[PDB]
Specification:
four-stranded mixed beta sheet; three-stranded mixed beta sheet; 14 helices; 20% strand; binds chloride ion
């Protein structure tokens, strides 16, 4: 859903901008849950209606909201938390907020009760600004296919040059750390190590996916030697296995092993009880978007949140 929302939005942004310049321009498409929100300033009511047909021609779109005016910025996680104090971190994760012009749009899959609460909180934070709600209540196979490599591409990023992480070390690819020394030369040599050539501090995607496989294998061995992680891992299907490998990549073997109660529920296949519980940890607090995708993967056993 992450990849389809973005994929469609850009195709609509780009095919729409093309049509406008054939009659500088202002068009913006935002995608949430395959529902699409059209933003910008067009000159005539007929063009606004034509840009809306472009979007509705997207077979994978299950809704289109045309809010183009006839002559922006998405809220970041912290700014939403400043505004939704009192709502659980889990419910805040099912909400996108955008301000385009002098309007503020609120998208999300909410209970009728949750809608009135969040609508209230947003209206009091913006004051006398217009607030548009776009709520939903509680074949198509041409898109990219999701796998574990594309999963951790969305959750960490793909870097094809040696970059410094946050801890002051050197890294490349998908979080594949090279060395904790501040010596770049030390990192460039270790980069040649795993690739076996004159990388020159640069790699291709084909040979970054080769690293990512080495990193995945390394995790799966730590997992099978850890007394708490092994039985859970063995009992789970393929997608749910990549959810677990995701958490290990993020917190290390020992970190994940501390989720005692949530692990017992996964090994017991209680998918929904395991989700309510994982959404109560510091993990959800400090990386809610990721933890929302990882946790839905655990609940559905599918690539929904990522597709
Ligand atoms: Cl933030
Ligand atoms: Cl996050």
């Amino acid at each position: 859903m992450e990849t389809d929302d973005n994929v469609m939005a850009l195709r609509i942004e780009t095919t729409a901008r093309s049509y406008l310049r054939q009659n500088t321009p202002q068009i913006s498409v935002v995608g949430y849950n395959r529902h699409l929100l059209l933003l910008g300033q067009v000159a005539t009511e007929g063009e606004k209606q034509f840009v809306g047909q472009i979007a509705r021609s997207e077979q994978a779109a299950e809704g289109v909201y045309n809010y183009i005016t006839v002559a922006g910025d998405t809220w970041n996680t912290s700014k939403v938390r400043a505004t939704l104090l009192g709502i659980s971190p889990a419910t805040q994760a099912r909400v996108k907020i955008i301000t385009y012009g002098n309007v503020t749009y609120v998208m999300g899959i909410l209970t009728p009760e949750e809608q009135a609460q969040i609508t209230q909180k947003v209206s009091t934070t913006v004051g006398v600004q217009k607030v548009i709600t776009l709520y939903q209540n509680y074949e198509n196979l041409y898109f990219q296919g999701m796998n574990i490599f594309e999963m951790l591409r969305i959750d960490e990023g793909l870097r094809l040059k040696i970059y410094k992480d946050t801890e002051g070390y050197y890294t490349i690819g998908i979080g594949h750390l090279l060395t904790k020394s501040p010596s770049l030369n030390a990192a460039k040599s270790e980069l040649d190590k795993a690739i076996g050539r004159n990388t020159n501090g640069v790699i291709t995607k084909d040979e970054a996916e080769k690293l990512f496989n080495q990193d995945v294998d390394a995790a799966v061995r730590g997992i099978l030697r850890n007394a708490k992680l092994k039985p859970v891992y063995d009992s789970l299907d393929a997608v749910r296995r990549a959810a677990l490998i995701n958490m290990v990549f993020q917190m290390g073997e020992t970190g994940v092993a501390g989720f005692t109660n949530s692990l017992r529920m996964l090994q017991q296949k209680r998918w929904d009880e395991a989700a309510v519980n994982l959404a109560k940890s510091r993990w959800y607090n400090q990386t809610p978007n990721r933890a929302k995708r990882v946790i839905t993967t655990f609940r559905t056993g599918t690539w929904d949140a990522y597709a």
